[PDB]
Amino acid sequence: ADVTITVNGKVVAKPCTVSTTNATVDLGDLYSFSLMSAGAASAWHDVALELTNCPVGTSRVTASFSGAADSTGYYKNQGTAQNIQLELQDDSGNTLNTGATKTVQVDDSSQSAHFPLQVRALTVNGGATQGTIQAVISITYTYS
Amino acid sequence: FACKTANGTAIPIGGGSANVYVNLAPVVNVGQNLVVDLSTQIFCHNDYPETITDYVTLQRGSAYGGVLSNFSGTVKYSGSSYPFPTTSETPRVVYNSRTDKPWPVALYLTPVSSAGGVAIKAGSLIAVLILRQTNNYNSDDFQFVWNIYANNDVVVPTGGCDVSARDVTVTLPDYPGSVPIPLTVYCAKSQNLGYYLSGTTADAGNSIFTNTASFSPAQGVGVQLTRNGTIIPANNTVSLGAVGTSAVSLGLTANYARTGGQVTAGNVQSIIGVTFVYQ
Amino acid sequence: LTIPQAFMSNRARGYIPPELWDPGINAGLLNYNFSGNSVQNRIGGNSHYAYLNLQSGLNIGAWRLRDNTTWSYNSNKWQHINTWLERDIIPLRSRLTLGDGYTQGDIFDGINFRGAQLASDDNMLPDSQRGFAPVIHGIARGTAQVTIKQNGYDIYNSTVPPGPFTINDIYAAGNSGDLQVTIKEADGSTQIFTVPYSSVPLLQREGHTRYSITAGEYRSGNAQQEKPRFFQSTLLHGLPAGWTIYGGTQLADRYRAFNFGIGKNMGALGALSVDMTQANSTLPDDSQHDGQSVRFLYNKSLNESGTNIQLVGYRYSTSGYFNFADTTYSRYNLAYNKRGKLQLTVTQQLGRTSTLYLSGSHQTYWGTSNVDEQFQAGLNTAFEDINWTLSYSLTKNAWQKGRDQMLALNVNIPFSHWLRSQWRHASASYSMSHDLNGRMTNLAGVYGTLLEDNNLSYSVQTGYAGGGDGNSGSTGYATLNYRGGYGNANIGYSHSDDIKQLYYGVSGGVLAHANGVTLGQPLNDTVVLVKAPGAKDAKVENQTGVRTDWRGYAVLPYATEYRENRVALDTNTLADNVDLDNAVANVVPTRGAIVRAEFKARVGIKLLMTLTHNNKPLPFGAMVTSESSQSSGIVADNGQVYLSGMPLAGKVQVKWGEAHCVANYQLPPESQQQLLTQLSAECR
Amino acid sequence: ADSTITIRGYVRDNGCSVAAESTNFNIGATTPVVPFRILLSPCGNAVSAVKVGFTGVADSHNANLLALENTVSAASGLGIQLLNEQQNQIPLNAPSSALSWTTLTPGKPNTLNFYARLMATQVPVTAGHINATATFTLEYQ
Amino acid sequence: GVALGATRVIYPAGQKQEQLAVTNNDENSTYLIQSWVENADGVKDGRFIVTPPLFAMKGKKENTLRILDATNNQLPQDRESLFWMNVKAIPSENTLQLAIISRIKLYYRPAKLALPPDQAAEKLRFRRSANSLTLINPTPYYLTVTELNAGTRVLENALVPPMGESTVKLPSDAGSNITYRTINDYGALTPKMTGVME
């Protein structure tokens, strides 16, 4: 009343810390009789990316995926095995190909994010040739 | 008889009646606070001093107008203290010179509040005075009404204390952070002072002010005010001790605070009102 | 008898009958996840944080009850988060959830609530009945052969009886192109027709209906936002000629929204879905408004040039259109609602080893001239094994002034490139990030798996940041993660210019069942229990770090619901006296189910008797059973029978027709050391 | 960048899923031929050539005839002669040196069609039940 | 129909046992699997015991065979040894029935071998005579040469013994250069190579 104070400011989202930096998925030894028909795929393998120590002000985290994708759109195989591609999805049945982004909320009680994913190897053209499978997917996080 | 001022030089309309546009420098003083000092502005002279000598007086009924119309005080008429509003005719002042001598008239206001004030915008009337002028040449006596107008925006103090600024804006750093609020108060006499904040608080303790941001508010966070690391709840009096003519800093420091649950990025804005109370 | 297959009730490939789906076993479930850090600063001192997330659960037959809690300590009380009781309705192909949950943002916005929700499940459909794919209709003069070619490769080959035929088992592979269907008659006449197709996310296969019915109380997580009761129902129905008709409705005390729309698979022009939502909303200030929002989505598959328009979306909302969350505030930017949102997502293939990617979002509000902008363009190059990435990002928020830009260059080089050693499972990463405002950060890191089973994963990355704000510094992050048979653990150390912090954590899952308690890695939604008593450390192959307990039970954290999962034990890791009757089992679990994979591990000396009856070898196929133990076998050539888990000395019963023989043996006491032993016996 | 996912694995090669089909039923009398087939499907990509041979109990009259089982009611001098796709006698109990490599197309199912016919040599051949269990040997390259 | 998990089994010296897989994809068929390992001379000597030697498979089922050594280091330790692994599926009215035997190569590989397996196919040598081509292999590996081409005519496949030789019939209408391919330890085809005379 006698004197007025206008206090302005802003809350901005600061980066968290990444707990899983070099996650790996070992599909094991696959058999070519099960990956012969077109569209045949291996079994789903789960991979989880968790972040911790999210500062207050960061309520959502968006992970962007990137990798070498062949003409089929799935991540290319740098191993010897041919006619095979690496597929990555979330638990919501959404294909997170190269360039795809998924957004999750930050648990207020523990200040931690968690990306539930699942990876497999599938043949689209059919006839998966014998050989090694090796692929790398790089994920970058933007905090909002 | 010609009267003029350097800044406005208002044209008189309707005989001796005229307006004026003069700057205001209200300063808190012991007893009463001066509002307008017409001595530095109004300059009057006699066109023909050798033939006609004028006598100017202030008739009863002169008062304030608008928001000031409910306030009183005193008038320094040629160095004489006369109670205000004018309930009687003041002694006249002679004019028999061609020089633009200053008009010895000062206007005061009686303190009725603790430290509050009223804001007057430019171009708004403040006082309405009734003047009566006679002459030694003959019985030509004429009365007119002078209305005082403001050419600038200023807040005339109503209480016995003054503050550095009536409106203070402070920008906190990004969450989390703090900022000291620049605000000091002084008074004409050594007296105890107490101030309490105001506003729409959020928590049940009346200590966290709601984030009243217009565009993209940051939910779950509000603004607190502290002093010397002590939380100040709203509508709780804090005593400043003995405050004299020297300015005393309230020590207020704005800080962030958490109101609800998850904090979301965005803007934060809180408007707080501090009122001063005598002790 | 020749019948057209259009009404032959043909089954899709990968069709598992609903009677084979396993509800699981009754069990108790726990997931613990403890994390913490001990920060140290040059100015400020030491700080401690800890967070224990505890998720409890219980399966009783066909239900699944789950609960979440978190204990947080800072330098201090439990805090409930969620709880829900769920089951799946097989006859309706649906799933009902009671308690804390969320809706789906297919049509309206995502809404958290605490009520009931019955929604159709897409995981019950076979893998060839999920997504969008045209239903190929045709006619055949006689017994013909139908082959569908996509991108030059035969993806569907079948023999069709005379008469009209329909095919609906096509996999969702619209990104490959167009399906050229050719039907060859016995004489030789060929019928050719091409079906090109593209799908937006809201296109359903012909005859397929998706739905959700939710009734509850809007839970928001905000202390200034009310919790009003609401009912939301959404539906989508595929239709012939590549159509899809969908809609929905939200009803509440101060909100009524009705949405209706249609999508079409135009073919060579790509898929386009248009819908319109009319919302009448009563604002917190008791002011009624009405509005209409129109949303278009467009999707084009890969062309010959390689370009595919993954998404082009545009949503326009009038002045009076408000969301449900807007009217829930307790009696804000309600005068600055959104005018229009434009989304773009495009991908290009620039040769055999290069891929370009574009993404962008542009949100314009009512009243204000501020716009929310987001842009992200990437270029990926493969080379042989050196992966290069050049990314650019541009973000501008409406409530802040200035554009956050970034231009990053990443290089990934496996160490197998430099080598022909434990460094085969390792690689090097170099990042160079430019803020486009003066700042510049270099980063160099080495990461990979370490242990024999590749459980331990290390990652050490140093870096230097400088410029822009003058805060030049060197920062190092070292992370060590581990996945054991009793749970996961992780350590981390982040040394900045001033802040030095240490992160620690341990996570795991505990399963309580009729056979006791079993520890393992953090459980996912569906879990498989490997019951193999007598096998101490048998490696569950195709799983990382999973070993059986000292009793023989191991929990597999992950299993695919409503699909056949193969659970196998590695016989190279079994003890010298343990023989599995069958090392491989198959499980078909439902969502949330804990299914046992029971294995019969005979423990004892393995032996190979040569049985002789009447001075002649025992006949082929004769059954042999141990009396004291439970071992059994079938006589092979030369009268040799192999028995596992036999005692040191006992009796053998032989039966080959309408017992007939008794065999006694006495091995030396030092015969257990040998993996397999051979002996001879006799009969009556 | 911030995180990486390294997917490793191996795709192995396998044999051929072989499905066989049971066959229902003067000197040198030959009955009409009954056809049967051997279906190799699915066959791995690396499976290029295989060796196919037939094994069984040679007849007393001649070693090139598959003898019948020792049935209590079995015809005397009655054997089962196996003909290849080109209607030529398949050498019974042929060694690996005598056997030859037959090629298979990877991916597509492969079929090997043979015929079986009853051969009577001890005329007058008595009446008896006909039963035989032969062995189809498939050796991988 | 039964299917083995591999067309070759490499048995390193000193291992406790090796593992193979059998798969029956027929939902209605029923089989009796009998397995055994014979030496290079085709006589069952009991040097390797496949466990379980005889077991019944009902319908669609995937089972595991454990090949157990019995050599006790009585075999040569300087050259690879060859055995034949046989897996027979007895199926289970005037009906002729067929029992399918699947035959694969079991390569006993002694430990501490000098030449790496990858560089074994490059060390063969050839010599051409009147209607005969002799392949000599000085490596201590059993080398399976396939897709032999002496110019334009296609020659027969061969299995050249370690530190040994083999002979392939050569028609007169043959070219000067010879191109050959071998099959590595994983069952894959090695790249085409050019043979060298003498």
PDB file of C-alpha atoms in Angstrom, chain C residues 29-33 53-57 66-69 84 523:
ATOM      1  CA  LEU C  29       6.922 -58.543  -6.292  1.00  0.00           C
ATOM      2  CA  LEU C  30       9.310 -55.814  -5.167  1.00  0.00           C
ATOM      3  CA  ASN C  31      11.513 -53.391  -7.105  1.00  0.00           C
ATOM      4  CA  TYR C  32      14.031 -51.391  -5.081  1.00  0.00           C
ATOM      5  CA  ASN C  33      16.137 -48.594  -6.558  1.00  0.00           C
ATOM      6  CA  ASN C  53      12.180 -45.830  -4.943  1.00  0.00           C
ATOM      7  CA  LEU C  54      10.211 -48.910  -3.878  1.00  0.00           C
ATOM      8  CA  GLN C  55       7.595 -50.473  -6.165  1.00  0.00           C
ATOM      9  CA  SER C  56       5.575 -53.262  -4.562  1.00  0.00           C
ATOM     10  CA  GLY C  57       3.193 -55.598  -6.324  1.00  0.00           C
ATOM     11  CA  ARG C  66       1.028 -52.407  -8.063  1.00  0.00           C
ATOM     12  CA  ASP C  67       2.109 -49.620  -5.714  1.00  0.00           C
ATOM     13  CA  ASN C  68       4.872 -46.994  -5.771  1.00  0.00           C
ATOM     14  CA  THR C  69       6.611 -45.236  -2.885  1.00  0.00           C
ATOM     15  CA  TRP C  84      -3.350 -49.516  -9.589  1.00  0.00           C
ATOM     16  CA  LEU C 523      11.912 -56.534 -12.965  1.00  0.00           C
TER      17      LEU C 523
END
